[PDB]
Design a protein around this nucleic acid. Structure first.
Ligand SMILES: *OCCCN1/C(=C/C=C/C=C/C2=[N+](CCCO)c3ccccc3C2(C)C)C(C)(C)c2ccccc21
Ligand SMILES: [Cl-]
Length: 759
DNA sequence: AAAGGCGCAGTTCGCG
DNA sequence: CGCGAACTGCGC
């Protein structure tokens, strides 16, 4: 099984290293014959000689073109003749490419920023993570001594805990009386002993939770203090820091540093992403949190250090359990995209698509379009019309069916051959013309993307049948990830088309997909209303909620199925409208905001405050109580009584702090903000103390009593203590609970005033 | 357990 | 006072 690739340089020459695990053994293969290259489009072919005469400097050495060869390629399906320029070292390319592009004979240049190790994987058609090779893993976590306002890395590391399938242990330099604690003499001997543990176990994967940003950087700081070479690599190297957009990520050579944080952050939508929250969210079991104050407290005085030890052990253990569960999904996705799990696990869907397309472009001899420069990126600034959203008919309705398309957008892309190479092609025999926006798509040949996207859907269908046929639970689980990875990739082509930084960016294509999607859904609604007697209550993009106002549960069900059998022949083959489910009651508040209840009492909520992290738990739970009363039974007057005792509790300061926390994400550097709402106001104070604030950070704040501008009376949720603070009962009644329950109860004639306690 | 796409409902706060 | 830009997070 291929894990990863890199290169090193021997005597000036690049040597690819392929890191593999074969038959229980880690292997390194070397490739010294691989030549870096990019392509040049010339005016005259006779100009190639002056292009080879071009030179540049790399650390004082003169870099030149090693050799060039004229090649025949396709560019967006059209024939193109370019010169492949070979170099001795991949580092020659950045050094020399600008001066070559500048040359008066060079129309343009291509494929000059594909990193050498990634290029190797693509050109050699190698796929990482193939096979059944079992990989050993090791999780680890550290615990640091922290005090208010301190610089990063100055305080020592108190604990390093680790875990694999067999055990979870803790290394520390004070005496703690627990079976799983290992006591050594100093911080240095603790870090040294951890190194020894890792080298001993020799894990293929190192799992951390936010290790990319904290654990490796802090171990780095400490190791430089204590004079310790931090050797974690299988080749005996220190962990390598790589840049990833604004963020940092950490490699460990010969191993896979699987940082769970960016994976979970992409995968699951949660209010907070603390290790405790994630574990609770994934495994259902709760995990107790010990704060850096309590930790610091205990260390100064050997007090409650068994609780801190337990905490540290649990960090590593829990980190290992989540690692084991998220890894396989990430490996299938890596196998699909054809890039290392290290890269893939830290990539957006858009980046995954691009790596997929770069590899497919190589297979089919399609020259890749470049990433857009600053200028072109400005011409990609305009937006376009998206999904259709129907203004709902507000209120409570009985006996609702939800009908929808599955994979609307990729079906459209395949059906109509939507593709930047099929867009606006002259002299074709057959065209598909997008509604409203009017773009023509040639149908005489499968386009680059639709071809790839059609292969995906077939392969997925093959895997689903294997999955359903198999009696082997392990194979079933594996195929399930495989088919889930294909879906994600299939679903990302659309977004990619309209993503301004894409090589295969195409606004006209993304517009056409959305215009078709509107045509189809609006047609389905029109037929359902006119042909059958249904009242369409609401619709969004690819699906709709409907019912027949007089009808009982059985009539609506029958009539819905019968409408599908009527409507589906009238849609293109790939576009199948499906019956998703039946709901005894539903309540639609506004666009994007509704909630339904099914026959088994289960309630589904969409868009309402209940599902948002920037609404306090008291406003959300209460809004839930109100919805439950109105959905489960028909009792409005119950919901009002619910709101009565909640606002009454709040006004008398009896609701715990836990239910008052509001969560809001920082989305940019704090300097770039131009309007300072409470979450920025809190974040700015934190940063003033010495707390690292990065885009993506979630601020948890509570609103204390005392009035005026909200951001002033807001404090971080952790620093709230009832012995010192009184919360703003007025804010949580008037700005949280009452507005949240008003959305619903205003539909029944209740205003904010008759729901309060006082006045 | 889709979303670097777009369509929306909504809160904060300074503004005249 | 009402208004509107700034800003967040949702549904697809
Ligand atoms: O989409 C949110 C994350 C889903 N997800 C995964 C979830 C694994 C869950 C395991 C749960 C579990 N429970 C709780 C069941 C609650 O409905 C439980 C209770 C009693 C005994 C055993 C268990 C186990 C531990 C089975 C995984 C599969 C990790 C995954 C991978 C990739 C993306 C999302 C998810
Ligand atoms: Cl280009």
């Amino acid at each position: 099984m291929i894990l990863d690739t890199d290169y090193i340089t021997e005597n000036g020459k690049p040597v690819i290293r392929v890191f593999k695990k074969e038959n229980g053994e880690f292997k390194i293969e070397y490739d010294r014959t691989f030549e870096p290259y990019f392509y040049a489009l010339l005016k005259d072919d006779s100009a190639i000689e002056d292009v080879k005469k071009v030179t540049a400097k790399r650390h004082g050495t003169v870099v030149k073109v090693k050799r060039a060869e004229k090649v025949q390629k396709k560019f967006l399906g059209r024939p193109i003749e370019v010169w492949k320029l070979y170099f001795n070292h991949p580092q020659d390319v950045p050094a020399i490419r600008d001066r070559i592009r500048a040359h008066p004979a060079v129309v343009d240049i291509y494929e000059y920023d594909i990193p050498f190790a990634k290029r190797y994987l693509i050109d050699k058609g190698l796929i990482p993570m193939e096979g059944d090779e079992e990989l050993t893993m090791l999780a680890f976590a550290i615990a640091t001594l922290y005090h208010e306002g301190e610089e990063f890395g100055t305080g020592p590391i108190l604990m390093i805990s680790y875990a694999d399938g067999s055990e979870a242990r803790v290394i520390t330099w004070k005496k703690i009386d627990l079976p799983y604690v290992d006591v050594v003499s100093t911080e240095k001997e603790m870090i040294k002993r951890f190194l020894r543990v890792v080298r001993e176990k020799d894990p293929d994967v190192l799992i951390t939770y936010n290790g990319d940003n904290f654990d490796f950087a802090y171990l780095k700081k400490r190791c430089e203090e204590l004079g310790i070479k931090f050797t974690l690599g299988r080749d005996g190297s220190e962990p390598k820091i790589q840049r990833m957009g604004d963020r940092f990520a950490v490699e460990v050579k010969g191993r896979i540093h699987f940082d769970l944080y960016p994976v979970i952050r992409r995968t699951i939508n949660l209010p907070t992403y603390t290790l405790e929250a994630v574990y609770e969210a994934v495994f259902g079991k709760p995990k107790e949190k010990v704060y850096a104050e309590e930790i610091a407290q205990a260390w100064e005085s050997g007090e409650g250090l068994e609780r801190v030890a337990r905490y540290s052990m649990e960090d590593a253990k829990v980190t290992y359990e989540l690692g084991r569960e998220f890894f396989p999904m990430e490996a299938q996705l890596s196998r699909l995209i054809g890039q290392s799990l290290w890269d893939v696990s830290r990539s957006s869907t858009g980046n995954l698509v691009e790596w997929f397309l770069l590899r497919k472009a190589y297979k089919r001899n399609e020259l890749a379009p470049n990433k857009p420069d600053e200028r072109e990126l400005a011409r990609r600034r305009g937006g376009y019309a998206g999904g259709y959203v129907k203004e709902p008919e507000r209120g409570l309705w009985d006996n609702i069916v939800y009908l929808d398309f599955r994979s609307l957008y990729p079906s459209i892309i395949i059906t109509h051959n939507v593709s930047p190479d099929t867009l606006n092609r002259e002299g074709c025999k057959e065209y598909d013309v997008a509604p409203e926006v009017g773009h023509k798509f040639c149908k005489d040949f499968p386009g680059f993307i639709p071809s790839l996207l059609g292969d995906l859907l077939e392969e997925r269908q093959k895997i689903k049948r294997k999955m359903k046929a198999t009696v082997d639970p392990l194979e079933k689980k594996l195929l399930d990830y495989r088919q889930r990875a294909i879906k994600i990739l299939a679903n990302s082509f659309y977004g990619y088309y309209g993503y301004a930084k894409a090589r295969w960016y195409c606004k006209e294509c993304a517009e056409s997909v959305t215009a078709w999607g509107r045509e189809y859904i609006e047609m389905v609604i029109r037929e359902l209303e006119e042909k059958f007697g249904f009242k369409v209550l609401y619709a969004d993009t690819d699906g709709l909620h409907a019912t027949i106002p007089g009808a009982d549960a059985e009539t609506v069900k029958k009539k819905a199925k019968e409408f599908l059998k009527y409507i589906n022949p009238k849609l293109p083959g790939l576009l199948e409208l499906e019956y998703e489910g039946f709901y005894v009651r539903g309540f639609f508040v506004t666009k994007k905001k509704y909630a339904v209840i099914d026959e088994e009492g289960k309630i589904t909520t969409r868009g309402l405050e209940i599902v948002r992290r920037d609404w306090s738990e008291i406003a959300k739970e209460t809004q839930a109580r109100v919805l439950e009363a109105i959905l489960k039974h028909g009792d409005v007057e119950e919901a009002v009584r619910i709101v009565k005792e909640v606002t009454e509790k709040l006004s008398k300061y009896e609701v715990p702090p836990e239910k008052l926390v509001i969560h809001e994400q920082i989305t940019r550097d704090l300097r770039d903000y131009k309007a300072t709402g409470p979450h920025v106001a809190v974040a700015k104070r934190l940063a003033a103390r010495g707390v690292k604030i990065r885009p993506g950070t979630v601020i948890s704040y509570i609103v204390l009593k005392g009035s005026g501008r909200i951001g002033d009376r807001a404090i971080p949720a952790d620093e709230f203590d009832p012995t010192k603070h009184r919360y703003d009962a007025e804010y949580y009644i008037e700005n949280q609970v009452l507005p949240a329950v008003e959305r619903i109860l205003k539909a029944f004639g209740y205003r904010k005033e008759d729901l309060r306690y006082q006045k």
